[PDB]
A paper describes a structure:
Proteinaceous microcompartments, called carboxysomes, play a critical role in CCM function, housing two enzymes to enhance CO2 fixation: carbonic anhydrase (CA) and Rubisco. Here, the CA converts HCO3− to CO2 to elevate luminal CO2, promoting Rubisco-catalyzed CO2 reduction. Correspondingly, microbial and biochemical studies have established an absolute requirement for CA activity within the carboxysome The α-carboxysome contains a highly divergent β-CA known as CsoSCA, characterization of which has occurred exclusively through the isoform from the chemoautotroph Halothiobacillus neapolitanus. Our results show that the Cyanobium CsoSCA is allosterically activated by the Rubisco substrate ribulose-1,5-bisphosphate and forms a hexameric trimer of dimers.
To understand the structural basis for RuBP activation, CsoSCA was co-crystallized with RuBP. Diffracting crystals were obtained almost exclusively in saturating levels of RuBP with the final CsoSCA crystal structure solved through molecular replacement to a resolution of 2.3 Å. The resulting structure showed a homohexameric trimer of dimers consistently arranged in the asymmetric unit with P212121 symmetry. A metal ion is evident at each apex, coordinated by a His3(H2O)3 octahedral coordination sphere, comprising His155 donated by a distinct monomer. The electron density and coordination geometry are consistent with a zinc ion. Density corresponding to a HCO3− ion was observed at one of the trimer apices. While variations in omit map density at these positions were observed, given the consistency of this density across each chain, the dependence on RuBP for crystallization, and the observation that RuBP was an allosteric activator of CA, we were confident in the modeling of RuBP at this site. Most notably, RuBP curls around Lys469, mediating multiple H-bonds with the ligand. The Cys2His(H2O) tetrahedral coordination of the catalytic zinc ion typical of β-CAs is maintained, and the overarching active site is highly homologous between each CsoSCA isoform. Manual inspection of H-bonds within the protein identified a network linking the catalytic Asp246 backbone and the Arg266 side chain that, in turn, binds RuBP, mediated by a water molecule and Leu249 backbone groups.
Author numbering:
A (entry chain E): 117 to 577
B (entry chain F): 116 to 577
The structure:
C-alpha cells in the first residue's frame, strides 16, 4: 500500500460500492427463482417471501396475482425492481451519508476552508457524463460531494453561457451574504474539466463523444474552459476573471492526470503530470516527504509559473487520487473488468446528486428530448446490448432539480418530468409498446438536503 | 378635439412610421398580382425585376421567374420571399434610423432612466401578452423609450418566474460590481409589470385567446405570476429582499390602458381599476399643469390600499402618455381599430423581437424548443391558415434568437438553435411544408450591442 493511501477509507468506499451493486445485481437471480415457481399453488405467497428476504421489499401484487393468464410479466417486474432499488439506494444516501460529505459534515467544512486558503471560493467540476466517471468526485479525488458543484456532460462539453450565469450567481451571493466569503476577498471561481481515456484499449474504450481520441477530448474540454474564462473577462468590468483546471482520468485504473496551469490558465495539452508517475515517485518515501515531493512535482509540471494555491490544491488531488489507485489495485486487480459500459439504468435530466458509483448509471444531460436525443439514443443503444439482448427492459430515471423556494417550482419540475416521459414514449414506441422501456419520474428540492421524490412511472396499475 | 396632455408631434411621427412599414408589406400582394398578369409577356423577367425594384426596393429570385414558363409562376415562394425581404429592410431601418427615437443613449432613454430612478425603480421589466395587437404597447400605448425597458412577451402574459428571479439576480450583480443602473445600496426596487389585454367592442371573442377571451381570468393569471415572482425573491435571498409589482391591461380596440393601482406592498384589487378613458375625460378641460396633478390624484385614490409615492408618480406618467395614444387612435383610426382581430403579416418564433413595435405586424410565439412552444405555435399556424393559406399564400415564419456577443461561440449556438427549430417546425407541419405553404427565415441578433439582426438561413433555396 502506498504510504499516502487512506486504507480504512478504501475499505469503507469498497464496502459501499459492493453493497449498492449487490442490491441491483441480486434482482435477476431472484426473478429467476420466482419464474420457476409461477405454477405452484402458493406462488404469490412464496414470491413475496422470497423478495422480502432477498431484496428487502415486496413486489406489486397485481403482477403476481395475474401471472396465470399472460404468464409472469418479468420485463415489468424487472423494471419495477430496478426502480424500487434505486429509490431505496437514493433515500439511504441522504439518510446515512455513506460518503461522509453532506452539507455540514466535518469533511465538507474542512474542505471548504481548505479551498478558501488555496484562493478559491467555489469549485465547479464538469466530468464527462460517462458512467465510468460517476465516482470521480467521491472515489477518484476523495472530495466531499457537497463542497463541489458537479456538472456532467457528454464529452465534458458544459454550457459556457450557463456557467457564466453560475459565476454571476456566486458573486451576487458573496455581495449580499458574504457567502462563502466577502466579495472583496482575493479569491477566484475555479472551473474544472475532467475528461477520460482508456489506457488498456485506447482505440475503443475512450470517450465515445469524441470518437475515443484522447487529444480531442482533452482539447474540447480546454476549449470550453478557455471560452468560459474569456466570457467572464469580456462581460464584466474591472478585474473579472476565473481560474481553470483541465484534468483527465484513466477509466481502467482511475489514475488522474493534471495539466498543471500557469497563473492565468496557460495550459499545455501535450504535457501532463500522471498520478501513476507521482505514485511511483513517492512510493518509497515516508509520508511527510512524499507530500513534499508531490508538491515539487506539481510545481515543476506547471505550464508557466503557477499560482501557489493552485499548486497546493492540485497536490492534494494527487495525494487523494493515490488512494484510489491503490483502491483499484486492491479490489479490481489494477484494471476494472467492466472496462466498458455496465450501467444498471439510464438517468436523464439534471445530474443526480446522489449517484457516486462507477458503472451504475448512464447519464444523459438534457432539458428536453428535442435536444440531446442524440445523447439519449446512445444510452438506449447501449442498453439494447445490456438488457434487451437478454430480454430485460431499458430502465430510465428522469431527474429534475427545482428551487424549493420559488412558489410552484416543484409543480413545474413534475410537469417537466412528464414532458420528458411523453417525448421518450414517442421516440421509442417499438420498445415502449413491447414493454422493453420504462421511465421513473423523480424531482429533487435543491434548496435543502433531502431525498428526491418519485412522481410517476410508465409502470401503471 | 385634442386633449391638453396629448403630444401632437409625437403622434404624427409615430403615425408616419406605422404607415410606412404597413405600406411596405401591403404593396406585396398588389405587386405580385401585377406580375401574375404579365407572366406570358416576352420581356417578363426583365419587367418583373423593374417593377420589383420600383415598388418594393429589392429584386426577386431569378430562378423563380426564369422557370415560370414550364413550372408556373411560384407565387407561394415569391410571397414568402417578399415578406422576408420586407421584414429584413424594415428591421434594419429600425436599427439604422431609430424611428421610435428611443435607442440606447438617445436623449429620450437618458431622461426616462433618470425619471425611473427618481420614482424608486432601477429596472422596469414588462411582460405583455405575445398577442400581435400588443406589439406596440411599449412604444405607442405607454410611449416608453424601448431601450430603457425589458420587454418579455409571453402568451397570456405568463412569464417564467424562475428566469425572472434570475434576471433580478443579474441586475443586482451589475449594481454591486458596476453601479449600473445605480449603486447597490441605493433604495430602489426592481419593478415587474404584467400587461394583459381585452376588447371593449367584443369582450367575448376578441380578448386574450390564451385565457378564453375571459378578461377577469387574463387579469388574475397575470397577477398570480407577479405575486409568485415577488414570493420567489423574498423567499430566496436574505435581508428582506423584495420587488414591486404592477398589473395593467390595454384595450385592443382603443389602445386605452387601465391600471390596478397597487398599495405599497403590491396589494392589488382585480375587480376594480382605473381606466385611462375616465382619466382622459376627467382632465380634459384643464391646463396641462393641473391636468397632471389631477391624474396623480386619481391614481392616488384608485389604489387598493395606501400606495407607494414613487409608484403613483410613475403610473400617472404612464396615464399621461397613454392619453396621447388614446387621441392617436381617435384621429387616425376613427377611434376603433378597424382590424380588431388578428391580421399579422408573419409569425415570429423564439425570443421576442427587439425591433417589432407595430400593432398587427407579428404573431409572436415564445419558445426555446418546439417541444415546449408547440401549443402556442399551433395557434399561430391556425390563425395563418385563415389569413394566408385560405387564399393560396404560405405561412411565413421568422425565427429569432438573441445571443450575447461577448460570449465566444454564442452566435454559433444561436444559429444552431435556429436550425434545430427549423427542423422541428418542418416535422410538425409536414403537409404545409412540402406543399410550399410554410417557409421559415432564421435570424439571430447580438443583444450585447445595438446592431441589426442577421439572417442565417431560410427554407427558400435554389
Ligand atoms: O453541483 C451540485 C451537485 O452536483 P451533483 O448533484 O451531480 O452531485 C449542486 O451544488 C447542488 O447539489 C445542487 O443543489 P443542492 O445544493 O440542493 O444539492
Ligand atoms: O435585449 C435587449 C438588448 O438589446 P439592444 O440593446 O441591442 O437593443 C433588451 O435589453 C431586452 O431584450 C428588452 O427588450 P426592449 O429593450 O425592446 O424593451
Ligand atoms: Zn466520455
Ligand atoms: Zn393575449
Amino acid at each position: 500500500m502506498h504510504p499516502l493511501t487512506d486504507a480504512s477509507a478504501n475499505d469503507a468506499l469498497h464496502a459501499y460500492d459492493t453493497a449498492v451493486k449487490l442490491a441491483f445485481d441480486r434482482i435477476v437471480p431472484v426473478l429467476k427463482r420466482l419464474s420457476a415457481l409461477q405454477h405452484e399453488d402458493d406462488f404469490v405467497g412464496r414470491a413475496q417471501a422470497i423478495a422480502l428476504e432477498e431484496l428487502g421489499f415486496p413486489l406489486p401484487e397485481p403482477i403476481l396475482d395475474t401471472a396465470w393468464v399472460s404468464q409472469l410479466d418479468m420485463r415489468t417486474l424487472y423494471a419495477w425492481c430496478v426502480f424500487e432499488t434505486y429509490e431505496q439506494t437514493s433515500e439511504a444516501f441522504f439518510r446515512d451519508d455513506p460518503l461522509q460529505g453532506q452539507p455540514g459534515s466535518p469533511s465538507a467544512e474542512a474542505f471548504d476552508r481548505f479551498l478558501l486558503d488555496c484562493g478559491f471560493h467555489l469549485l465547479d467540476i464538469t466530468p464527462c457524463a460517462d458512467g465510468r466517471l460517476a465516482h470521480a468526485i467521491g472515489f477518484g479525488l476523495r472530495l466531499p460531494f457537497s463542497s463541489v458543484r458537479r456538472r456532467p456532460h457528454a464529452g465534458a462539453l458544459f454550457d459556457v453561457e450557463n456557467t457564466v450565469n453560475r459565476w454571476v450567481k456566486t458573486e451576487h451571493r458573496r455581495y449580499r451574504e458574504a457567502q462563502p466569503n466577502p466579495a472583496h476577498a482575493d479569491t477566484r471561481y475555479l472551473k474544472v474539466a475532467l475528461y477520460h481515456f482508456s489506457s488498456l484499449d485506447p482505440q475503443h474504450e475512450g470517450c465515445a463523444a469524441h470518437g475515443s481520441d484522447d487529444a480531442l477530448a482533452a482539447s474540447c474540454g480546454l476549449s470550453r474552459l478557455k471560452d468560459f474564462q474569456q466570457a467572464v473577462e469580456n462581460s464584466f468590468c474591472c478585474g473579472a476573471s476565473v481560474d481553470l483546471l483541465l484534468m483527465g482520468i484513466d477509466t481502467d485504473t482511475d489514475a488522474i492526470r493534471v495539466h498543471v496551469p500557469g497563473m492565468d490558465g496557460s495550459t499545455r495539452l501535450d504535457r501532463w503530470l500522471d498520478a501513476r508517475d507521482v505514485y511511483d515517485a513517492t512510493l518509497g518515501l515516508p509520508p511527510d516527504q512524499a507530500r513534499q515531493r508531490v508538491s515539487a512535482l506539481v510545481q515543476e509540471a506547471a505550464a508557466s509559473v503557477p499560482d501557489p494555491g493552485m499548486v497546493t490544491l492540485v497536490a492534494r488531488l494527487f495525494e487523494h487520487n493515490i488512494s484510489q489507485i491503490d483502491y483499484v489495485r486492491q479490489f479490481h486487480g489494477g484494471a476494472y473488468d467492466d472496462a466498458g459500459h455496465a450501467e444498471r439504468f439510464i438517468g436523464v435530466g439534471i445530474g443526480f446528486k446522489e449517484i457516486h458509483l462507477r458503472n451504475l448509471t448512464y447519464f444523459a444531460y438534457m432539458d428536453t428530448v428535442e435536444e440531446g436525443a442524440a445523447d439519449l439514443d446512445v444510452g438506449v443503444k447501449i442498453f439494447k446490448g445490456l438488457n434487451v439482448s437478454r430480454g430485460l427492459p431499458v430502465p430510465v430515471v428522469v431527474r429534475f432539480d427545482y428551487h424549493g423556494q420559488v412558489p410552484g417550482a416543484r409543480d413545474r419540475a413534475v410537469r417537466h418530468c412528464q414532458r420528458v416521459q411523453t417525448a421518450i414514449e414517442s421516440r421509442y414506441p417499438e420498445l415502449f409498446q413491447q414493454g422493453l422501456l420504462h421511465a421513473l419520474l423523480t424531482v429533487r428540492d435543491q434548496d435543502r438536503h433531502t431525498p428526491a421524490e418519485a412522481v410517476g412511472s410508465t409502470i401503471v396499475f
